[PDB]
């Protein structure tokens, strides 16, 4: 029921429907329909009307812009709709599509071998160098600088010297981010843990330290079902492969508790 704003990832998903050619614009007379998609994405159960689209659409920009039916460049609509963090993430991903999580995980493992869920902020630029390499991608030294320094802005404000996986994972250019699938609010990173703790407790009957197979499957359904309900059936497989794909170390087929915590936005403090 709370106000729910469109993030950079969502903004792109809807945008692409209108700019499949990726010219970077959409007809300005189509801003009314761009909002119906937004409203339907944010409030999935709401029954949207034409009147509502106008009321919401308008509240999002100047009275003047409301009449702006001309060509709107992607940066313009994003500037009129997305907050900074999600905004900068939109521009960064567009100029540096880094849509390879397989290697993100690997690079994350290097700077966070115990899967605490954080990397020392001192390793940022070093980190951004490796990520581009696994993507075999090269950029100018300055752009790397700007990016490194721009990210410290939205990920290290507390300036406590540490960046969190829940933030850095967001720089990836993935329509549906392998990880960014969970709630990220106040107690949302709390409640999810308690339920994560008891749920990891149940399945690991032998009390070893890792779940394998049915245990991993049972956890998943008895985890995600409550994280983000109304999920498909076959929509647990890639969830189960992505694990031993982007988490566990050896090919044991087991899923360690700490590795598992990472993907949940949570963090297992041993």
UniProtKB/Swiss-Prot annotation:
| GO BP annotation list | brain development; spinal cord motor neuron differentiation
GO molecular function per UniProt: calcium ion binding
Location in or out of the cell: Cytoplasm
Where the record annotates domain EF-hand, the positions are 6-41, 51-87, 99-134, 143-178, 191-226, 235-270
Q: Tell me if Magnesium is a UniProt keyword of this record.
A: no
- Binding residue positions for Ca(2+) 1: 19, 21, 23, 25, 30
Which parts of the chain span the membrane according to its record? none
Binding annotation for Ca(2+) 5? 248, 250, 252, 254, 259
Pfam families, per this entry?
EF-hand_5, EF-hand_7
Query: For binding Ca(2+) 4, which residues are annotated in this chain's numbering?
Result: 204, 206, 208, 215
The answer to whether UniProt assigns keyword Cytoplasm to this entry is yes
Question: Which annotated residues bind Ca(2+) 3?
Answer: 156, 158, 160, 162, 167
Instruction: Give the main localization category.
Output: cytoplasm
Q: Which UniProt keywords apply?
A: Calcium, Cytoplasm, Metal-binding, Repeat
Ligand binding (Ca(2+) 2)? 112, 114, 116, 118, 123
Q: Which PANTHER family match?
A: CALBINDIN (PTHR19972), SECRETAGOGIN (PTHR19972:SF15)
Protein's name according to its UniProt entry: Secretagogin
User: Which species is the source of this protein?
Assistant: Danio rerio (Zebrafish)
């Amino acid at each position: 029921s709370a106000f729910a704003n469109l993030d950079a990832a969502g903004f792109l998903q809807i945008w692409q429907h209108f700019d499949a050619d990726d010219n970077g614009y959409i007809e300005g007379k189509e801003l009314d329909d761009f909002f119906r998609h937004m409203l339907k994405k944010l409030q999935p159960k709401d029954k949207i009307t034409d009147e509502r689209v106008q009321q919401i659409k308008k509240s999002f920009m100047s009275a003047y812009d409301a009449t702006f039916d001309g060509r709107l460049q992607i940066e313009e609509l994003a500037n009129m709709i997305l907050p900074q963090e999600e905004n900068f993430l939109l521009i960064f991903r567009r100029e540096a599509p880094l849509d390879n999580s397989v290697e993100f995980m690997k690079i994350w493992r290097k700077y966070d071998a115990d899967s605490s869920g954080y990397i020392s902020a001192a390793e940022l630029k070093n980190f951004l160098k490796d990520l581009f390499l696994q993507h075999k991608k090269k950029i100018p030294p300055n752009k790397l600088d700007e990016y490194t320094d721009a990210m410290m802005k939205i990920f290290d404000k507390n300036k406590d010297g540490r960046l969190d996986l829940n933030d850095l994972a967001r720089i990836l250019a993935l329509q549906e981010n392998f990880l960014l699938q969970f709630k990220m609010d106040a107690s949302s990173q709390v409640e999810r843990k308690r339920d994560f703790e008891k749920i990891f407790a149940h399945y690991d009957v032998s009390r070893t330290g890792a779940l394998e197979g049915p245990e991993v499957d049972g956890f998943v359904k008895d985890m995600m079902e409550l994280v983000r309900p109304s999920i498909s059936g076959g929509d647990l497989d890639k969830f189960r492969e992505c694990l031993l794909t982007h988490c566990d170390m050896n090919k044991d087929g087991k899923i360690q508790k700490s590795e598992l915590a990472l993907c949940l936005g949570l963090k297992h403090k041993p």
